[PDB]
mmCIF file of C-alpha atoms in Angstrom:
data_model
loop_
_atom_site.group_PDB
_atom_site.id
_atom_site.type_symbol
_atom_site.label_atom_id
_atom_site.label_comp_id
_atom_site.label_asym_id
_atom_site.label_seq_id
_atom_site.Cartn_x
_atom_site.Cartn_y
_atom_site.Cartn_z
ATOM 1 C CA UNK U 23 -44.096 11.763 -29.011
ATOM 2 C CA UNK U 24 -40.809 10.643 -29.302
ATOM 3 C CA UNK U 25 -40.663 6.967 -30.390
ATOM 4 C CA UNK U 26 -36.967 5.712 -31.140
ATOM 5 C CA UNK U 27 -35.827 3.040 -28.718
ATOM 6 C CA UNK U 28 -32.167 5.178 -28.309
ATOM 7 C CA UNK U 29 -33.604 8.488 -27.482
ATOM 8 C CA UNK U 30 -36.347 7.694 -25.481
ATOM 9 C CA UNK U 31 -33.573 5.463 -23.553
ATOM 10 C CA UNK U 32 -31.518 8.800 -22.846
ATOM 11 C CA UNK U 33 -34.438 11.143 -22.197
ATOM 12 C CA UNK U 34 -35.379 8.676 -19.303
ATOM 13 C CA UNK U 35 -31.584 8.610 -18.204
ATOM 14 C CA UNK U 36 -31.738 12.885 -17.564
ATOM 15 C CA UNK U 37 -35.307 12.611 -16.232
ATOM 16 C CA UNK U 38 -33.616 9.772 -13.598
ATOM 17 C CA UNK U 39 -31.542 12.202 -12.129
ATOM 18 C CA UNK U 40 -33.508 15.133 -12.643
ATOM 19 C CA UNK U 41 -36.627 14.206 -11.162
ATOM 20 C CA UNK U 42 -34.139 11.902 -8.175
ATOM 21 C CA UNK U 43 -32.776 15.421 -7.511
ATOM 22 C CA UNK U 44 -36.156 17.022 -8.028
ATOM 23 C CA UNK U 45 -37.594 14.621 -5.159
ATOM 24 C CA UNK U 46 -34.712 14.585 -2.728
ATOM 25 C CA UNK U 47 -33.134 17.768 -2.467
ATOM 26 C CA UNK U 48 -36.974 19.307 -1.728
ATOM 27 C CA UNK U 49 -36.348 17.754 1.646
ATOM 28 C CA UNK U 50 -32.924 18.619 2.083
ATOM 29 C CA UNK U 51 -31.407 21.704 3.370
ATOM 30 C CA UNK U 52 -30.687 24.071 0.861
ATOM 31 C CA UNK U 53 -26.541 23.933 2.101
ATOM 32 C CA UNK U 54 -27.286 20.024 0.843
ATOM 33 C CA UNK U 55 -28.495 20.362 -2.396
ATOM 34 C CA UNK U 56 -25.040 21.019 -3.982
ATOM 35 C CA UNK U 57 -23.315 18.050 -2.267
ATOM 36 C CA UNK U 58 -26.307 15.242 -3.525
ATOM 37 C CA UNK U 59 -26.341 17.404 -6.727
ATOM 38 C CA UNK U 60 -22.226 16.783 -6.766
ATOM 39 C CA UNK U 61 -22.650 12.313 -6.488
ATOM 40 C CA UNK U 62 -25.386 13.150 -8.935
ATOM 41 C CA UNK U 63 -22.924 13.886 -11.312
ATOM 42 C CA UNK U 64 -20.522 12.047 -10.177
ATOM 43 C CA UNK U 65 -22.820 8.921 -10.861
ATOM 44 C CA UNK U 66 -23.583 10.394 -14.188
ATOM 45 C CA UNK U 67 -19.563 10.519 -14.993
ATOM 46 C CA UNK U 68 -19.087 7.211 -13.478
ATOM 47 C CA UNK U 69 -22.121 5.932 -16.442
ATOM 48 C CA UNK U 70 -21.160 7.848 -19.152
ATOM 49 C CA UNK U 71 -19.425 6.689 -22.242
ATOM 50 C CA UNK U 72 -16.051 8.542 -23.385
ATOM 51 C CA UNK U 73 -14.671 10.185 -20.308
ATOM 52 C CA UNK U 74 -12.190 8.952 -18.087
ATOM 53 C CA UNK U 75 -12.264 7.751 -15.052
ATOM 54 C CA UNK U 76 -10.647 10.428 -13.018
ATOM 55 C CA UNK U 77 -10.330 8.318 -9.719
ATOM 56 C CA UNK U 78 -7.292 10.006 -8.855
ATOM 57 C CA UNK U 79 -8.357 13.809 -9.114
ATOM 58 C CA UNK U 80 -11.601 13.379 -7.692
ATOM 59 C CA UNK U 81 -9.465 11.151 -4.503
ATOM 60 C CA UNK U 82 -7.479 14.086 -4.443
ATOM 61 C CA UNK U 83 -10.621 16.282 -4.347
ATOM 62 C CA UNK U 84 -11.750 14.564 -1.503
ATOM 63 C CA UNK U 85 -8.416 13.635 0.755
ATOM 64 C CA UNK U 86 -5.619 16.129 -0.325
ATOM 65 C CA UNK U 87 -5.235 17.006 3.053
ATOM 66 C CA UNK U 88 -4.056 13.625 3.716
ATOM 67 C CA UNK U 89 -1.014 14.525 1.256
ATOM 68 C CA UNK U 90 1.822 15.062 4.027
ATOM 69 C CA UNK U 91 4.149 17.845 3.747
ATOM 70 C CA UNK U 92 7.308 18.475 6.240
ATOM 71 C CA UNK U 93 7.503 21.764 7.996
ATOM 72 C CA UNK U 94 9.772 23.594 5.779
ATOM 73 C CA UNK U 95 9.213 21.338 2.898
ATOM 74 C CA UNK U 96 6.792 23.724 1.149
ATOM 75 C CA UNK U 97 8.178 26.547 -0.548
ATOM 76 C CA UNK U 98 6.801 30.599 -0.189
ATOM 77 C CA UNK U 99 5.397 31.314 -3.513
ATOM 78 C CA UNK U 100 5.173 35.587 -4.033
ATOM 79 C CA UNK U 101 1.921 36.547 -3.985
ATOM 80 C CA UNK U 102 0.412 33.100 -2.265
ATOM 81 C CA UNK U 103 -0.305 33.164 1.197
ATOM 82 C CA UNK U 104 1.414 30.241 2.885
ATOM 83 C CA UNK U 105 -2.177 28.025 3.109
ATOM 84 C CA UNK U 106 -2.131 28.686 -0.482
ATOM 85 C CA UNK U 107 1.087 27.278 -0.836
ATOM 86 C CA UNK U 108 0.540 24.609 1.412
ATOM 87 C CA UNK U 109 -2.047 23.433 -0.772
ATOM 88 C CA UNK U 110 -0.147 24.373 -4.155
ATOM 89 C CA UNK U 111 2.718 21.628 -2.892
ATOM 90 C CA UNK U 112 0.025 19.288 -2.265
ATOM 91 C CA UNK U 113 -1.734 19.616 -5.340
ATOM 92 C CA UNK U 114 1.179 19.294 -6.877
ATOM 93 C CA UNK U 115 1.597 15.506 -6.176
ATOM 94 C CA UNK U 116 -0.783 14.926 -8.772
ATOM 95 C CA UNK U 117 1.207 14.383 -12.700
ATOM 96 C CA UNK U 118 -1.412 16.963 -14.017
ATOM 97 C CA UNK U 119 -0.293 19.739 -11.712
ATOM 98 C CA UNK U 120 3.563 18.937 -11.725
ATOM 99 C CA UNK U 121 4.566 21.954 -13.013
ATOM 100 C CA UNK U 122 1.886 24.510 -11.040
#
């Protein structure tokens, strides 16, 4: 039905990862559907036009446990528990979160 060249282009875009997903993730474990649904979007993000890039948050996603903080370094926060603090400090190394 739908005949311009533009909107038939993006229809088959979603039905890419839809029906990818569709196909894959019925022979995955259900605990794995959420991380191929997660590069899913991720590839989606990296394609799209207008957003940025957001190498750094989503490295920090991935490694922020490779952030080093000294023993004693991190502060007690009231009302945090010290893991949450631990990983308030090292979420704070990112410019977005400087003043957490």
């Amino acid at each position: 039905g739908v005949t311009d060249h533009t909107q038939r282009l993006s229809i088959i875009t979603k039905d890419l990862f839809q029906v990818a997903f569709n196909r894959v993730a019925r022979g995955m474990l259900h605990q794995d559907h959420i991380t191929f649904a997660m590069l899913l979007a991720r590839i989606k993000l990296k394609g799209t036009v207008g957003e940025p890039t957001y190498d750094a948050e989503f490295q920090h996603f991935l490694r922020g446990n490779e952030i080093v903080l000294s023993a004693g370094s991190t502060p007690r926060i009231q009302g945090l528990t010290v893991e949450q603090a631990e990983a308030v400090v090292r979420l704070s190394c990112l410019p977005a979160f400087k003043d957490l």
